[PDB]
Amino acid sequence: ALEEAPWPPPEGAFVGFVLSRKEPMWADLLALAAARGGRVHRAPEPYKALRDLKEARGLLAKDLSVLALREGLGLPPGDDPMLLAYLLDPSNTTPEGVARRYGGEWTEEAGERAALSERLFANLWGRLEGEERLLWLYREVERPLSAVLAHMEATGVRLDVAYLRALSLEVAEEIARLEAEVFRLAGHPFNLNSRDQLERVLFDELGLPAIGKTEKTGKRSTSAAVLEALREAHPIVEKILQYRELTKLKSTYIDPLPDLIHPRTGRLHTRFNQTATATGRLSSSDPNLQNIPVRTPLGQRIRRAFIAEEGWLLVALDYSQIELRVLAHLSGDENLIRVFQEGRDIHTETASWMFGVPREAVDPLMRRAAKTINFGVLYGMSAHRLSQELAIPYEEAQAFIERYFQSFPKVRAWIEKTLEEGRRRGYVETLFGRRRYVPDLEARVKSVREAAERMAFNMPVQGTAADLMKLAMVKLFPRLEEMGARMLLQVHDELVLEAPKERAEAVARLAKEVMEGVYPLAVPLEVEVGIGEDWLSAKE
DNA sequence: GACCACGGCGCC
DNA sequence: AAAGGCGCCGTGGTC
Ligand SMILES: [Mg+2]
Ligand SMILES: [Mg+2]
């Protein structure tokens, strides 16, 4: 096949590499190679050879860049065929799949991976010709974002380990109180972590009424939704609900996170997966830092563990109602656009009609209720499902659905146009032309078809919000470098940065402006910003 | 030790 | 606490 030539490769070569494990912050670089111009070059010693590359160009380029950064080398990621394939079709999420589909095989040898990266890029680049909008997304968003993501991953975030270890002991004792009480109420001990055993106790032994069934295997459900509805049926239910919350938080965050501190950085390093979702969102794994608790009292105590470096502060920026602002722009609805242009709070307007009075002081709970209905109607829930899900008579539900769409006729028209076009072309698109293929828009099984319609009109909204955030990160990153600040985390419509204390206020101002002005829409974008020593404080 | 499907549930 | 989009936990089961 390719001609074998000595290391190092010429500039522009495609790289292949093998890691001992998937997480580049934790991986041993086992082998490194490069392919170009009909030649393949294999590195005698991979870590040393890393020093010869100017760019990581090839499949999974960002992963190699993260390892390089870990080793003190400023090796940026460049072209990556994964990103081309993901823009053609976001179900293209793995190198194994992308290779099979576009002209090779993903193996475990660096030379082969290098040669593969080269051929896949050639082929996929050809596919993106004529695709002007996908090309722009590649050049202006995805390719530059991979470098930003590489820096975020390699930087990591600081965690108060001692605090979490002390917290574990406290939660353990509370969990023991709950499980002892549950077993007494049951009349015998069992495995409270087993939903199958819990099912027998609740519905067979205590004879509580089963309310719902599980999706795939049709067992009587013990989900929080069922338990909430049985809260007053028996005192064991509230205890179980509390046990669920504590064990969830303890097993997922409190116990695992302290063990994941990197020995060299003394920080926690997530992976930001760039080709993992059907809508263009990022995902986070190993550990997932996009789902750190924030709602409950114990969740808030966990979030306080994420702290700024000594002498630095966290800066937290959140887009306000990005998805509804995107929907206003996509649909062109005059009335919805007027809402945002006039700084009015849409969920409060709906809370004036329902729960009113008063317009001035609707109160939190009623607004949360109005929000729930606004989005419910939006996702095409029936007057029946809304009336029963939201403890209100059937008539009220219908009235609100008609009002909602009489106020925003173009939102309805936009949803209808998007579904028809998805059916015809087989895909739907974000504002920037990112695509998702949704085949089941024609299924003859109504539950299947209707689930598809929800996916289909969700994608342009969630996906455009993702495009905007990604473009914002791409724009914001060089500015932070210049100011000596760091970008740490993204959580879909939020960013968390770290800045020296003397510069935190300027960083927050600047970041807020870059985010709000990322790509002007028919409505303003609003960003709320907070500064603090820890992630919870930085929003309070 | 690993994988899996599942139910369940943390976040946006 | 908006929940379509995710990733992780333990169970029960397999290999
Ligand atoms: Mg928010
Ligand atoms: Mg699942």
Q: What is the DSSP string of A302-320?
A: HHTTEEPPTTEEEEEEEES
Cβ–Cβ under 8 Å, residues A290 and A469 = no
Q: Pick from A166, A122, A136: which is nearest to A255 by CA? A: A166
A240: its two tokens: 């179980």
* Three-class secondary structure of residue A3 per DSSP: strand
Q: What is the C-alpha separation between A480 and A498, in angstroms, rounded?
A: 10
Q: What is the C-alpha separation between A107 and A276, in angstroms, rounded?
A: 20
Can you tell me which residue has the tokens 């993106």? A128
Whole-Å CA distances, A200 to A171, A186, A204, A210: 27, 11, 5, 11
Q: Cα A97 to the chain's mean position, in Å? A: 22
A453: its two tokens: 């319609």
> Are residues A368 and A278 both part of a single domain?
no
Distance C10 C1' – A248 CA (angstroms): 10
CATH code (residue A264):
1.20.1060.10
> Are residues A316 and A263 both part of a single domain?
no
A508 sits in which H/E element: helix A501-516
How many CB atoms neighbour CB A37 within 10 A? 12
Strand B reaches within 7 A of the A221 CB: yes
Domain boundary among A411, A434, A465: A465
Q: Cα A434 to the chain's mean position, in Å? A: 17
Can you tell me which residue has the tokens 């993260």? A66
Pairing between strand A3-5 and A39-42? parallel
Q: Show which positions of strand C are touched by protein (CB under 7 A).
A: 1-12
The residue type of A172 is A
Q: Show which positions of strand B are touched by protein (CB under 7 A).
A: 5-12
Q: A125 is in which domain, residue-wise?
A: 1-154
Instruction: Report which residue is nearest nucleotide C8 when distances run from CA to C1'.
Output: A252
Domain boundary among A465, A498, A516: A465
> Are residues A143 and A219 both part of a single domain?
no
CATH code (residue A293):
3.30.70.370
Neighbouring residues of A482: CB distance < 8 A, sequence distance ≥ 6: none
> Are residues A48 and A4 both part of a single domain?
yes
Cα first-last separation, chain A: 61
Q: Pick from A358, A360, A354: which is nearest to A373 by CA? A: A354
Distance B1 C1' – A172 CA (angstroms): 28
Pairing between strand A435-437 and A427-429? antiparallel
> Are residues A331 and A389 both part of a single domain?
yes
Strand partners, A157: A268
CATH code (residue A388):
1.10.150.20
A39 sits in which H/E element: strand A39-42
Q: What is the C-alpha separation between A474 and A481, in angstroms, rounded?
A: 12
Q: What is the C-alpha separation between A258 and A165, in angstroms, rounded?
A: 8
Experimental technique used? X-ray
> Are residues A199 and A304 both part of a single domain?
no
The residue type of A515 is M
Q: Which residues touch strand C (CB under 7 A)?
A: A 191, 193-197, 251-252, 256, 273, 276-279, 281, 283-288, 290-291, 295-296, 323, 368, 371-372, 375, 378-379, 451, 454-455, 458-459, 462, 492
A397: its two tokens: 């539900």
Q: Pick from A418, A415, A412, A416: which is nearest to A436 by CA? A: A418
A58: its two tokens: 């090839």
A473 sits in which H/E element: helix A446-483
Domain boundary among A410, A437, A465: A465
Strand B reaches within 7 A of the A493 CB: yes
Contacts 24+ apart (CB under 8 A), A1-4: A1/A40, A1/A115, A2/A35, A2/A38, A2/A39, A2/A40, A2/A111, A2/A115, A3/A38, A3/A39, A3/A40, A4/A39, A4/A40, A4/A41, A4/A42
Phi-psi region of A12 (alpha: psi -120 to 50; beta: other; left: phi over 0): left
Strand partners, A271: A285
Distance B9 C1' – A465 CA (angstroms): 24
> Are residues A110 and A139 both part of a single domain?
yes
> Are residues A9 and A144 both part of a single domain?
yes
Entry field: residues in chain A? 540
> Are residues A121 and A171 both part of a single domain?
no
A317: its two tokens: 């920026």
Q: What is the C-alpha separation between A116 and A33, in angstroms, rounded?
A: 11
Work out the angle at residue A88's Cα, subtended by the Cα atoms of residues A84 and A89, and round it to the nearest 5 degrees: 115
Q: What is the C-alpha separation between A503 and A12, in angstroms, rounded?
A: 38
> Are residues A66 and A82 both part of a single domain?
yes
Across A233-253, b (16+ Cβ under 10 Å) vs e yields: eeebbbbbebbbbbbebbebb
From the CA of A150, how far away is ligand 2's center (Å)? 28
Cβ–Cβ under 8 Å, residues A7 and A44 = yes
> Are residues A98 and A245 both part of a single domain?
no
DSSP character string of A210-231:
P--B-TTT-PBP--HHHHHTTT
Across A445-462, b (16+ Cβ under 10 Å) vs e yields: eeeeeeebbebbbbbbbb
Q: What is the spatial order of strands in the sheet that A29-36 belongs to? A: A3-5, A39-42, A29-36, A14-19
